Amino acid sequence: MKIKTIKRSADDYVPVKSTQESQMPRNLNPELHPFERAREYTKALNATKLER
Amino acid sequence: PPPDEEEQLLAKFVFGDTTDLQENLAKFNADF
Amino acid sequence: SSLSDQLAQVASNNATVALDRKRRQKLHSASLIYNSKTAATQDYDFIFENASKALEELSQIEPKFAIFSRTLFSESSISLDRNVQTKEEIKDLDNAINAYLLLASSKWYLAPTLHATEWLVRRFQIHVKNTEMLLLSTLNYYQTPVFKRILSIIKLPPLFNCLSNFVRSEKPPTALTMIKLFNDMDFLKLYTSYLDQCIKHNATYTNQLLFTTCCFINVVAFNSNNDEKLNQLVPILLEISAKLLASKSKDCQIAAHTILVVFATALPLKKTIILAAMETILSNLDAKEAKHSALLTICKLFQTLKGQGNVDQLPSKIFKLFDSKFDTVSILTFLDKEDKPVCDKFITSYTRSIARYDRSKLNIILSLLKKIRLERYEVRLIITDLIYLSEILEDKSQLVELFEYFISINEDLVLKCLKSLGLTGXXXXXX
Amino acid sequence: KVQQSEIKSSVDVSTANKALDLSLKEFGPYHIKYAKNGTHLLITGRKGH
Amino acid sequence: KVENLGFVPFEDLLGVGHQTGITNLIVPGAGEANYDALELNPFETKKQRQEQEVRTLLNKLPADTITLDPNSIGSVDKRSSTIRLNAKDLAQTTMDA
8 A cells, every 4th residue: 555645754844953044945836826916016016115 | 787785875875765774773673 | 521631632742743943942952961052052963973972982881782873873863753754663663762771771870871862862852752761771870960860851751750849850859759659559560561671681780670679678668558559569579570580690589589588578478379489489590699598588488478387398399499409518507607597487397398208318407406496386397297207217227316306305295296196105116 | 445544554653643633522513724824723613612 | 514624735634624523634645745935834933924924914915906817917908909009100090080
């Protein structure tokens, strides 16, 4: 029976030291980031409000 | 093309192989 | 039930998996040697650099740790965690840790051992997951500060709840609180499994066996009042003394002799049970230092029990086992000691088996009676068997010499029992 | 035909302990809404919880 | 009788809500095993969370934005001409008028 699940292992993500920054895993899939043009417009509108 | 044991030993360290340790950990059970 | 009591069951299950950096901070700060701040700010490899130096020093001391270099202290034993591996291999990881702690329970007064077990604490979470075998291994060092350190790290199981006020305590646990721990009925069975695993792996030493005897004697003494409790306590300390006698070491035999004496003195037993106590002591006794302790134990075990047939004849299996394992000259030189313990019930039970089985050596009882001072009824039972010996044996003159001692002192006793069995004037005709 | 009784034996102890089987008998059919990240759980008892 | 069922988004378990409480049945392949740390962190501390909700407050989407396609939010008005118009071509449109 080939059964295997998501093994997070709790050691790659949360660092062992208390001095290391937490690692940043990254999936660049388009489905995981839904709003592209909508969200970057709000980043653009906040940039114009910040520069004024 | 079968591998040599030297490149087999180098592959086990470089891939994070735990099968060799798990076999070596269940091998002994009251060996004395 | 309610909700929050079920959550603590989940929290006790998942107390080793790190979820946040706060949970990693509160788990990596468990430290045998370093303080809290240094433990939180060090990596797994830096602990392993000192760990490989620690086990190399221990492999110099005893070479049994050379196995653990390649299974528990390999460089491949860094990336793996207990909480990523399934149930079929965490059992193999558990008893491998238990095999290491048993092989390193003796070596604890050395700083190489504390550095070696520090990485086993941090990498394999043994201060939360398997806390019992760690605490049993170091239990004899309770006066030492390394036990006070271990209590400050560990989370206590429900069975060691008597040490719940001694975690993070500036004063060490005392002698009285260790007996209150050992007074628990279930904890004695768990230490039995620890001791049976200790004997089976053949690593039993003086200090943990001195301490185990010092608590087994007290737990009978603290339960000497309740006769029901000592009835409940009989199948533990006798099974321990069965396994301790089965060990071939020079130390477990004397330690089993200490348990068997005080338990029978605080609790008289059935004759067949103490008869089995003879054969288990007499079986594997070959240590020279343990032969003197075994003779005093069989001496004390015979005078514990009281009743009819107390000083009767031993079985021939036990008597020939005692003849091989103890010479008659050896027990005579034991009686030569001016301390002269109370061997009265054993000697009159020994010589009745002498008069029954061998029927040839009666010069020993001539030297036995001159050495020991016997009571009234034991002399009567000796003379009655020697009178029965006078009926059946083809009477040599040394039998007449033996009764010549019997008329030299307390001649009314031999005359009275001769009136009970036969005629007084018929003794000279028959001898 | 693969059941949860034998999945838990062959699945690692991280997600085996995460297989949380609660028991809240005294209230109604509980409604579950996890958070958008799988870290917090919210129960909604039909009666009061 | 089950009430609802919901998956943990980044592990592989389904939480089934029954009358007597909560169960989590294990599945092999429900959740994605590669989460994005800039959107959703299962392992998020306090200081990472309280910065993120302020940042998401800055980057919040206004409620007008919700349409059939989010890619049609920076587009051109459909009633406008597809080609653009020159100043010469506007005057040619005036010549049409």
